[PDB]
Design an enzyme around this catalytic site. Structure first.
Site, PDB file in Angstrom:
ATOM      1  N   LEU A  15      40.276  45.327  40.973  1.00  0.00           N
ATOM      2  CA  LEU A  15      39.667  43.983  41.075  1.00  0.00           C
ATOM      3  C   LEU A  15      40.574  42.933  40.440  1.00  0.00           C
ATOM      4  O   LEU A  15      40.798  41.871  41.024  1.00  0.00           O
ATOM      5  CB  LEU A  15      38.278  43.953  40.427  1.00  0.00           C
ATOM      6  N   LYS A  17      44.174  42.538  37.387  1.00  0.00           N
ATOM      7  CA  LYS A  17      45.235  43.159  36.585  1.00  0.00           C
ATOM      8  C   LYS A  17      45.746  42.207  35.508  1.00  0.00           C
ATOM      9  O   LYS A  17      45.931  41.015  35.758  1.00  0.00           O
ATOM     10  CB  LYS A  17      46.402  43.591  37.481  1.00  0.00           C
ATOM     11  N   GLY A  18      45.973  42.757  34.316  1.00  0.00           N
ATOM     12  CA  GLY A  18      46.557  42.030  33.188  1.00  0.00           C
ATOM     13  C   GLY A  18      47.783  42.756  32.664  1.00  0.00           C
ATOM     14  O   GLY A  18      48.149  43.826  33.161  1.00  0.00           O
ATOM     15  N   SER A  22      43.433  46.295  32.910  1.00  0.00           N
ATOM     16  CA  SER A  22      43.044  46.133  34.316  1.00  0.00           C
ATOM     17  C   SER A  22      41.538  46.334  34.499  1.00  0.00           C
ATOM     18  O   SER A  22      40.897  46.995  33.683  1.00  0.00           O
ATOM     19  CB  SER A  22      43.809  47.116  35.212  1.00  0.00           C
ATOM     20  N   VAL A  23      41.000  45.757  35.575  1.00  0.00           N
ATOM     21  CA  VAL A  23      39.603  45.930  35.978  1.00  0.00           C
ATOM     22  C   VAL A  23      39.591  46.599  37.363  1.00  0.00           C
ATOM     23  O   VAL A  23      40.252  46.121  38.295  1.00  0.00           O
ATOM     24  CB  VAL A  23      38.849  44.579  36.025  1.00  0.00           C
ATOM     25  N   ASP A 132      38.279  31.127  27.166  1.00  0.00           N
ATOM     26  CA  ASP A 132      38.896  31.175  28.498  1.00  0.00           C
ATOM     27  C   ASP A 132      37.850  30.853  29.577  1.00  0.00           C
ATOM     28  O   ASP A 132      37.729  31.553  30.590  1.00  0.00           O
ATOM     29  CB  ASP A 132      39.546  32.557  28.714  1.00  0.00           C
TER      30      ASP A 132
HETATM   31  C1  LIG Z   1      37.464  41.727  48.652  1.00  0.00           C
HETATM   32  C2  LIG Z   1      37.965  40.817  47.530  1.00  0.00           C
HETATM   33  N1  LIG Z   1      37.179  41.055  46.310  1.00  0.00           N
HETATM   34  C3  LIG Z   1      37.329  40.275  45.212  1.00  0.00           C
HETATM   35  O1  LIG Z   1      38.119  39.347  45.221  1.00  0.00           O
HETATM   36  C4  LIG Z   1      36.542  40.515  43.980  1.00  0.00           C
HETATM   37  C5  LIG Z   1      35.229  41.020  44.015  1.00  0.00           C
HETATM   38  C6  LIG Z   1      34.563  41.206  42.827  1.00  0.00           C
HETATM   39  C7  LIG Z   1      35.185  40.905  41.605  1.00  0.00           C
HETATM   40  N2  LIG Z   1      34.449  41.105  40.439  1.00  0.00           N
HETATM   41  C8  LIG Z   1      34.869  41.033  39.101  1.00  0.00           C
HETATM   42  C9  LIG Z   1      36.076  40.464  38.642  1.00  0.00           C
HETATM   43  C10 LIG Z   1      36.364  40.452  37.273  1.00  0.00           C
HETATM   44  C11 LIG Z   1      37.615  39.852  36.771  1.00  0.00           C
HETATM   45  C12 LIG Z   1      38.858  40.458  37.000  1.00  0.00           C
HETATM   46  F1  LIG Z   1      38.935  41.609  37.704  1.00  0.00           F
HETATM   47  C13 LIG Z   1      40.008  39.856  36.499  1.00  0.00           C
HETATM   48  C14 LIG Z   1      39.933  38.672  35.783  1.00  0.00           C
HETATM   49  C15 LIG Z   1      38.709  38.074  35.553  1.00  0.00           C
HETATM   50  C16 LIG Z   1      37.551  38.656  36.042  1.00  0.00           C
HETATM   51 CL1  LIG Z   1      36.034  37.880  35.723  1.00  0.00          CL
HETATM   52  N3  LIG Z   1      35.514  40.946  36.383  1.00  0.00           N
HETATM   53  C17 LIG Z   1      34.373  41.481  36.744  1.00  0.00           C
HETATM   54  C18 LIG Z   1      34.002  41.553  38.097  1.00  0.00           C
HETATM   55  C19 LIG Z   1      32.684  42.190  38.159  1.00  0.00           C
HETATM   56  O2  LIG Z   1      32.073  42.391  39.187  1.00  0.00           O
HETATM   57  N4  LIG Z   1      32.252  42.494  36.923  1.00  0.00           N
HETATM   58  C20 LIG Z   1      33.260  42.097  35.944  1.00  0.00           C
HETATM   59  N5  LIG Z   1      36.422  40.416  41.616  1.00  0.00           N
HETATM   60  C21 LIG Z   1      37.102  40.222  42.729  1.00  0.00           C
END
Ligand SMILES: CCNC(=O)c1ccc(Nc2cc(-c3c(F)cccc3Cl)nc3c2C(=O)N=C3)nc1
Length: 278
Positions: A15, A17-18, A22-23, A132
């Site tokens: 989802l 990357k840092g 990473s998430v 942030d």
């Molecule tokens: C098909 C394309 N899909 C997306 O573009 C997508 C969908 C869901 C998504 N969700 C995120 C994204 C993050 C997140 C990260 F990954 C990096 C930096 C900042 C944040 Cl807030 N964090 C969480 C979530 C979540 O559901 N729960 C916590 N992020 C991207």
């Protein structure tokens, strides 16, 4: 219950990357029939001691926050610790506004503003500074509901002090930072209020890249941090978004008051946002 077994976390995709983390999108699927819930899972990758300690704090902070406008802590998974959050499939608010601009009007944007404000009001009541606050770190739960996310840089105030001094400044974009944060690394609820002002600018420009905070500040702008700080101390601010109501732009300017003391609290911003156009 809130302990998630590694073997049942089926990896799907990344989802975000840092540099030190990473998430990942996973399905927690104990039955193995693909019916289990989707979860967002944060983990550190080749981090140092400092980052692991921060990550332990982040887990406990998010675990203790209970609000409808803050991303939900689900649990943990254990060699290497992993933070399990709820998955919000619509993604972050920055991408959402750009993608669905034709569908979303000014009343929807003010609904998002109100909900972000309420989340931040709650965060201030827990003596927590987000550090942030930005459209990239706000998640979309549904078309009429957003939640604040990404508590990686979040810090609790000292029990007897209303401000926090950061020793090592974490490299995040400079165009959301308050003057005192840029000059002296001072962070507080009031510096979050400054950032909220930039979030309102982001919302009412629909997170358009051509007129983003960076793009617009860079137009106005020897070092970049020293130039931005010089510019803000002269009173120069981001422009009114074209499709912004006058009263909303006035609230942005109050959010950007030079002194933190002269900025309004989230408790004072909340009613002002909600009562607009009624
Ligand atoms: C098909 C394309 N899909 C997306 O573009 C997508 C969908 C869901 C998504 N969700 C995120 C994204 C993050 C997140 C990260 F990954 C990096 C930096 C900042 C944040 Cl807030 N964090 C969480 C979530 C979540 O559901 N729960 C916590 N992020 C991207």
């Amino acid at each position: 219950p809130t302990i998630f077994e590694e073997r049942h976390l089926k990896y799907i995709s990344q989802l975000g990357k840092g540099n030190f983390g990473s998430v990942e999108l996973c399905r927690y699927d104990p039955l193995g029939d693909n019916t289990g819930a989707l979860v967002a899972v944060k983990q550190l990758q080749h981090s140092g001691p400092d980052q692991q300690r921060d990550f332990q704090r982040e887990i406990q902070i998010l675990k203790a926050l209970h609000s409808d406008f803050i991303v939900k802590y689900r649990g943990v998974s254990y060699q290497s610790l992993r933070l399990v959050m709820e998955y919000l499939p619509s993604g972050c608010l920055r991408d959402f506004l750009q993608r669905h601009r034709a569908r979303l009007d000014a009343s929807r944007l003010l609904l998002y503003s109100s909900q972000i404000c309420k989340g931040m009001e709650y965060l201030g009541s827990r003596r927590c500074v987000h550090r942030d606050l930005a459209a990239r770190n706000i998640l979309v739960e549904s078309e009429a509901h957003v939640k604040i996310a990404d508590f990686g840089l979040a810090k609790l105030l000292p029990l007897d002090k209303d401000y926090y001094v950061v020793r090592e400044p974490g490299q995040s974009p400079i165009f959301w930072y308050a003057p005192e944060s840029l000059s002296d690394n001072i962070f507080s609820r009031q510096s979050d209020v400054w950032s909220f002002g930039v979030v309102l600018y982001e919302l009412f420009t629909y997170c358009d890249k051509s007129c983003s905070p960076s793009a617009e500040f860079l137009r106005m702008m020897v070092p970049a941090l020293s130039r931005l700080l010089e510019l803000l101390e002269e009173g120069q601010r981001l422009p009114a978004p074209p499709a912004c109501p006058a009263e909303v732009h006035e609230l942005m300017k109050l959010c950007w008051a030079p002194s933190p003391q002269d900025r309004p609290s989230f408790s004072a911003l909340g009613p002002q946002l909600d009562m607009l156009w009624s």
